[PDB]
Coordinates of C-alpha atoms in Angstrom, one line a residue:
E1 CA -3.3 28.5 20.2
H2 CA -0.6 26.1 19.0
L3 CA 1.5 24.2 21.4
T4 CA 5.0 25.7 21.7
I5 CA 7.6 24.0 24.0
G6 CA 11.0 25.1 25.1
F7 CA 14.0 22.9 25.2
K8 CA 17.7 23.0 26.1
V9 CA 20.5 22.6 23.6
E10 CA 23.9 21.0 24.0
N11 CA 26.2 21.4 21.0
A12 CA 29.8 20.7 19.8
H13 CA 31.0 24.1 21.1
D14 CA 29.8 23.2 24.6
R15 CA 31.4 19.8 24.5
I16 CA 34.6 21.1 23.1
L17 CA 35.1 23.8 25.8
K18 CA 34.6 21.1 28.3
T19 CA 37.4 19.1 26.7
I20 CA 39.7 22.1 26.5
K21 CA 39.3 23.2 30.1
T22 CA 39.2 19.6 31.5
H23 CA 42.7 19.1 30.2
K24 CA 43.9 22.7 30.3
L25 CA 44.5 23.0 26.6
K26 CA 44.1 26.8 26.9
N27 CA 47.6 27.2 25.1
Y28 CA 47.9 24.0 22.9
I29 CA 45.4 25.5 20.5
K30 CA 46.6 29.1 20.8
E31 CA 50.2 28.2 19.7
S32 CA 48.8 25.7 17.1
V33 CA 47.1 28.7 15.5
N34 CA 50.1 31.0 15.3
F35 CA 52.0 28.3 13.6
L36 CA 49.8 26.7 10.9
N37 CA 49.2 30.1 9.4
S38 CA 52.7 31.3 9.4
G39 CA 53.0 30.4 5.7
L40 CA 55.9 28.2 6.7
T41 CA 53.4 25.4 6.1
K42 CA 53.0 26.6 2.5
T43 CA 49.6 24.9 3.0
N44 CA 47.2 25.2 6.0
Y45 CA 46.3 22.0 7.7
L46 CA 42.6 21.2 7.1
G47 CA 42.8 17.7 8.4
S48 CA 44.0 14.1 7.5
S49 CA 42.3 10.7 7.2
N50 CA 44.1 10.0 10.5
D51 CA 42.9 13.2 12.1
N52 CA 39.4 14.0 11.0
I53 CA 36.0 15.3 12.2
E54 CA 33.3 12.8 13.0
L55 CA 29.6 13.8 12.7
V56 CA 29.0 12.3 16.1
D57 CA 31.2 15.0 17.6
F58 CA 29.0 17.7 16.2
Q59 CA 25.8 16.0 17.3
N60 CA 23.4 18.7 18.4
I61 CA 21.4 17.5 21.5
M62 CA 18.0 19.2 22.3
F63 CA 16.7 18.3 25.7
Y64 CA 13.0 18.3 26.5
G65 CA 12.6 17.0 30.1
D66 CA 9.0 17.6 30.9
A67 CA 7.1 14.9 28.9
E68 CA 5.2 12.0 30.4
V69 CA 4.4 8.4 29.6
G70 CA 1.9 6.6 31.7
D71 CA 0.4 7.5 35.1
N72 CA 2.7 6.5 37.9
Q73 CA 6.1 7.1 36.2
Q74 CA 9.3 8.8 36.7
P75 CA 9.7 11.9 34.5
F76 CA 11.4 11.3 31.2
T77 CA 13.9 13.5 29.4
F78 CA 13.6 13.1 25.6
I79 CA 15.7 14.5 22.9
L80 CA 14.3 15.8 19.6
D81 CA 15.3 13.9 16.4
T82 CA 14.0 14.9 13.0
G83 CA 15.7 11.8 11.6
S84 CA 13.7 9.4 13.7
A85 CA 10.0 8.5 13.3
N86 CA 9.3 6.8 16.7
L87 CA 9.2 7.5 20.4
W88 CA 11.8 5.4 22.2
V89 CA 11.6 4.8 25.9
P90 CA 14.0 2.8 28.0
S91 CA 12.1 0.0 29.7
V92 CA 12.4 -0.9 33.3
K93 CA 13.3 -4.3 31.9
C94 CA 16.4 -2.9 30.3
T95 CA 19.4 -4.3 32.1
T96 CA 22.2 -2.7 30.2
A97 CA 24.6 -0.3 32.0
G98 CA 23.3 2.7 30.2
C99 CA 19.7 2.0 31.5
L100 CA 20.8 1.8 35.1
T101 CA 21.6 5.5 34.8
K102 CA 18.4 6.6 33.2
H103 CA 14.7 6.9 34.2
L104 CA 12.9 3.7 33.2
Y105 CA 9.3 3.2 32.1
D106 CA 7.4 0.5 34.2
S107 CA 4.3 -0.4 32.3
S108 CA 3.0 -2.4 35.3
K109 CA 2.6 0.8 37.2
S110 CA 0.6 2.5 34.5
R111 CA -3.1 2.3 34.6
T112 CA -3.4 3.2 30.9
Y113 CA -0.9 0.8 29.4
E114 CA -1.9 -1.5 26.5
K115 CA 0.5 -4.2 25.5
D116 CA 1.6 -4.5 21.9
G117 CA 4.7 -6.6 22.0
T118 CA 5.7 -6.2 18.3
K119 CA 9.4 -6.7 18.5
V120 CA 11.8 -4.0 17.2
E121 CA 15.4 -4.9 16.6
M122 CA 18.0 -2.7 14.9
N123 CA 21.7 -3.4 14.1
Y124 CA 23.7 -0.3 14.2
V125 CA 27.4 -0.2 13.5
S126 CA 27.6 1.4 17.0
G127 CA 25.7 -1.6 18.5
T128 CA 22.3 -3.1 18.9
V129 CA 19.0 -1.5 20.1
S130 CA 16.2 -4.0 20.9
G131 CA 12.7 -3.8 22.2
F132 CA 9.0 -3.9 21.5
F133 CA 6.1 -1.6 20.9
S134 CA 3.9 -0.5 23.8
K135 CA 0.9 1.7 24.0
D136 CA 0.2 4.2 26.7
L137 CA -0.9 7.9 27.3
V138 CA 1.9 10.1 26.2
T139 CA 2.0 13.8 27.2
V140 CA 3.7 16.7 25.6
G141 CA 3.0 20.1 27.0
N142 CA -0.8 20.5 27.1
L143 CA -1.3 17.6 24.6
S144 CA -2.0 14.0 25.4
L145 CA -2.8 11.0 23.3
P146 CA -2.8 7.3 23.3
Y147 CA 0.4 6.4 21.4
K148 CA 2.5 3.4 20.3
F149 CA 6.1 4.0 21.5
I150 CA 9.0 1.6 21.8
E151 CA 10.1 0.0 25.1
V152 CA 13.8 -0.4 24.8
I153 CA 15.3 -3.5 26.4
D154 CA 18.8 -3.1 24.9
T155 CA 20.5 0.3 24.6
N156 CA 23.9 -0.8 23.4
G157 CA 23.2 0.6 20.0
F158 CA 23.6 4.2 20.7
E159 CA 25.1 3.9 24.2
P160 CA 28.3 5.9 23.4
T161 CA 26.3 9.1 23.4
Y162 CA 23.6 7.6 25.7
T163 CA 25.4 7.2 29.1
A164 CA 27.6 10.2 28.2
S165 CA 24.5 12.5 27.8
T166 CA 21.6 13.0 30.3
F167 CA 18.5 12.2 28.3
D168 CA 16.3 9.1 28.8
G169 CA 14.6 8.6 25.4
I170 CA 14.0 9.9 22.0
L171 CA 11.1 11.8 20.4
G172 CA 10.9 11.2 16.7
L173 CA 10.2 14.2 14.5
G174 CA 10.9 12.5 11.2
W175 CA 9.1 10.5 8.7
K176 CA 7.5 7.0 9.2
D177 CA 10.0 4.2 8.5
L178 CA 8.2 0.9 7.6
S179 CA 11.3 -1.1 8.3
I180 CA 10.6 -0.6 12.0
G181 CA 6.8 -0.3 12.2
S182 CA 3.7 1.0 10.7
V183 CA 3.2 3.6 13.5
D184 CA 2.9 7.2 12.5
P185 CA 5.1 9.9 13.8
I186 CA 3.7 11.6 17.0
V187 CA 3.1 14.9 15.2
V188 CA 1.2 13.0 12.5
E189 CA -0.7 11.0 15.2
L190 CA -1.8 14.2 16.9
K191 CA -3.3 15.4 13.6
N192 CA -4.9 11.9 13.1
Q193 CA -6.6 12.3 16.5
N194 CA -7.5 15.9 15.8
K195 CA -5.6 17.4 18.7
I196 CA -3.6 19.8 16.5
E197 CA -4.7 21.9 13.4
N198 CA -2.2 20.7 10.9
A199 CA 0.4 17.9 10.9
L200 CA 3.4 20.2 11.0
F201 CA 5.9 21.4 13.4
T202 CA 8.3 24.5 13.4
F203 CA 11.7 25.2 14.9
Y204 CA 12.5 28.6 16.2
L205 CA 16.2 28.8 17.3
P206 CA 16.9 32.1 19.1
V207 CA 20.0 33.4 17.5
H208 CA 21.4 34.8 20.7
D209 CA 20.8 31.8 22.8
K210 CA 22.3 28.7 21.3
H211 CA 21.4 26.8 24.4
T212 CA 17.7 27.3 23.7
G213 CA 15.2 26.4 21.0
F214 CA 11.4 26.3 20.6
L215 CA 9.3 23.6 19.0
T216 CA 5.8 24.5 17.9
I217 CA 3.4 21.7 17.0
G218 CA 0.2 22.1 14.8
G219 CA 0.6 25.5 13.3
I220 CA 2.8 28.4 12.2
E221 CA 2.9 31.3 14.7
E222 CA 3.3 34.4 12.5
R223 CA 5.3 36.2 15.2
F224 CA 8.3 33.7 14.7
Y225 CA 9.3 35.1 11.3
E226 CA 9.5 38.1 9.1
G227 CA 9.5 38.5 5.3
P228 CA 8.2 35.8 2.9
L229 CA 7.9 32.2 4.0
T230 CA 9.2 29.9 1.2
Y231 CA 8.3 26.3 0.8
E232 CA 10.8 23.7 -0.7
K233 CA 9.2 20.4 -1.5
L234 CA 11.0 17.3 -0.3
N235 CA 13.0 15.1 -2.7
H236 CA 12.9 12.2 -0.3
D237 CA 10.3 10.2 1.6
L238 CA 12.3 9.3 4.7
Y239 CA 14.1 12.5 5.3
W240 CA 13.5 16.3 5.6
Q241 CA 15.6 16.7 2.5
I242 CA 15.4 19.2 -0.3
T243 CA 17.2 20.2 -3.4
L244 CA 19.2 23.5 -3.5
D245 CA 21.8 25.1 -5.9
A246 CA 24.6 25.4 -3.3
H247 CA 27.5 27.6 -3.8
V248 CA 30.2 29.5 -1.7
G249 CA 31.6 32.4 -3.5
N250 CA 33.3 31.3 -6.8
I251 CA 33.1 27.5 -6.0
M252 CA 29.7 26.0 -6.8
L253 CA 27.6 22.9 -6.5
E254 CA 24.4 22.3 -8.6
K255 CA 21.1 20.6 -7.5
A256 CA 22.7 19.4 -4.3
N257 CA 20.6 17.5 -1.7
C258 CA 20.1 19.4 1.6
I259 CA 18.9 18.0 4.9
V260 CA 17.5 20.3 7.6
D261 CA 18.5 18.8 11.0
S262 CA 18.4 20.5 14.4
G263 CA 20.3 17.5 15.7
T264 CA 23.4 18.6 13.9
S265 CA 25.6 21.4 15.6
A266 CA 27.0 22.4 12.1
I267 CA 26.7 22.9 8.5
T268 CA 28.2 19.7 7.0
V269 CA 29.9 20.2 3.6
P270 CA 31.0 17.6 1.1
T271 CA 34.7 17.0 1.8
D272 CA 36.0 17.9 -1.6
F273 CA 34.0 21.1 -1.6
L274 CA 35.1 22.0 1.9
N275 CA 38.7 21.6 0.9
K276 CA 38.5 24.0 -2.1
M277 CA 36.5 26.3 0.3
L278 CA 39.1 26.7 2.9
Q279 CA 42.3 27.0 0.8
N280 CA 44.6 29.7 2.4
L281 CA 41.6 31.1 4.4
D282 CA 43.7 31.5 7.5
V283 CA 41.6 28.6 8.8
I284 CA 43.3 25.6 10.3
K285 CA 42.2 22.3 11.9
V286 CA 43.7 21.9 15.4
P287 CA 45.4 18.5 15.3
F288 CA 43.6 15.8 17.3
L289 CA 40.9 18.3 18.3
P290 CA 37.6 18.1 16.5
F291 CA 37.1 21.7 15.2
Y292 CA 38.4 24.3 12.8
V293 CA 39.8 27.6 14.2
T294 CA 40.1 31.1 12.8
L295 CA 40.4 34.6 14.3
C296 CA 36.9 35.9 14.3
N297 CA 38.2 39.1 12.8
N298 CA 38.8 37.2 9.6
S299 CA 38.1 39.3 6.5
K300 CA 38.0 36.6 3.9
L301 CA 35.5 34.3 5.6
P302 CA 32.9 33.1 3.1
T303 CA 29.2 33.2 3.0
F304 CA 27.1 30.1 2.2
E305 CA 24.6 30.6 -0.6
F306 CA 21.7 28.1 -1.3
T307 CA 19.6 28.7 -4.3
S308 CA 16.2 27.1 -5.3
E309 CA 13.5 27.9 -7.9
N310 CA 11.4 29.7 -5.4
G311 CA 13.9 31.2 -2.9
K312 CA 17.6 31.9 -2.1
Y313 CA 19.2 31.5 1.3
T314 CA 22.5 32.8 2.7
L315 CA 24.4 31.8 5.7
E316 CA 26.9 34.6 6.7
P317 CA 30.0 34.0 8.8
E318 CA 28.1 35.3 11.9
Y319 CA 26.0 32.2 12.1
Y320 CA 28.7 29.4 11.9
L321 CA 31.2 31.2 14.0
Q322 CA 31.2 30.7 17.8
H323 CA 33.6 33.0 19.8
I324 CA 36.2 31.0 21.7
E325 CA 37.6 34.4 22.7
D326 CA 37.8 33.0 26.3
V327 CA 40.5 30.6 25.1
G328 CA 42.5 33.4 23.3
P329 CA 42.5 37.0 21.7
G330 CA 40.7 36.8 18.3
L331 CA 39.7 33.1 18.1
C332 CA 36.5 31.5 17.1
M333 CA 35.7 27.9 16.0
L334 CA 33.6 27.1 13.0
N335 CA 30.4 25.1 13.2
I336 CA 31.3 23.6 9.9
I337 CA 32.5 20.1 9.1
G338 CA 33.2 17.8 6.2
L339 CA 30.8 14.9 5.6
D340 CA 30.5 12.7 2.5
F341 CA 27.2 11.2 1.4
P342 CA 26.7 8.8 -1.6
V343 CA 25.1 11.8 -3.3
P344 CA 26.6 15.3 -2.6
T345 CA 24.5 16.6 0.3
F346 CA 24.7 19.3 2.9
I347 CA 23.3 19.1 6.4
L348 CA 21.6 22.5 7.2
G349 CA 22.0 22.2 11.1
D350 CA 21.7 24.5 14.0
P351 CA 23.6 27.5 12.4
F352 CA 21.3 27.6 9.4
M353 CA 18.3 27.3 11.7
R354 CA 19.6 30.1 14.0
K355 CA 19.1 32.4 11.1
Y356 CA 16.1 30.8 9.4
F357 CA 12.8 29.8 11.0
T358 CA 12.1 26.4 9.7
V359 CA 8.7 24.7 9.1
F360 CA 8.3 21.0 8.8
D361 CA 5.0 20.1 7.0
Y362 CA 4.0 16.4 6.9
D363 CA 0.8 17.2 5.1
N364 CA 2.4 19.1 2.2
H365 CA 5.7 17.1 2.2
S366 CA 7.9 20.1 2.2
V367 CA 10.2 22.3 4.3
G368 CA 9.2 25.9 4.9
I369 CA 12.1 28.4 5.2
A370 CA 11.7 32.0 6.5
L371 CA 14.0 34.5 7.9
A372 CA 13.7 34.2 11.7
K373 CA 12.7 37.3 13.7
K374 CA 15.7 38.4 15.9
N375 CA 13.6 40.8 17.9
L376 CA 11.6 38.7 20.4

């Protein structure tokens, strides 16, 4: 009854393997492991200010390439983004080098296009994205609706990952940001136009296929989860952010903010917490390569524990460890990085969501967490 669409996923693990085999680093890492755990070091290398992990390197990219905008248009590949509120489409008027690569939306070829022209300009540290609002018939799966999206005329802002990747535009799955426009998120707008039952969407990430995920819009398909579904109300009005008592074994954090984000390939930890976490854990950071390594046989590998008033959630090693056994006997990288926010926060990315079926409820302003069903 509810619309469920399938999408492809590109993660850090994918991008890293590319880098390793592109430059034949099959034995730089292998030797770097056998050394930085020898005890010679007297302290394992977890990174430096010089050699660190950037969140952009662990950017989880979900491809949905069968959506439409307008009548006579090229197809557009969008990426899901729970941190954005709007739909962003590269205009045919965009003259940047990144746009020349992508499929561009020509409003003059669309029979159902209504001009808005409300300018949207953002100033990112990575550059500048510029454009204006446009209304047209947008189609996702078996759902269509007149929607105000953004025609981008300048893609320099996020171009680093833009020309690198293969997607054309962005599909917002976050909360309305009035600094950009008064337009509602496409999932909300579908509810506004009574095309879906409720203004919510769910993420089912198949634990055994990290290249695949499923987005369901409008309702909660019971089959996706087992056990009790727990709701955690949001502590923010712009993010899918909740408060959980977060601890790993003996080290503990209280009332920490936690963001659920499919667009992150990892569990991000506060840097200071991550350090006390990984002391003498036979886990090292490969120098000048953006990932931590350990032999997957590791006995002392910790389990994340997130506690709230209504539920408790655990992330065992099984979920943040991805086998790089192809690069050498025993090894596996960790989908865990260090990231500092003004307030101590965790990003509950892909690994958390591989274990837990996640519900994003606009109407109830909360995140619903349930143990995903592994069997179909």
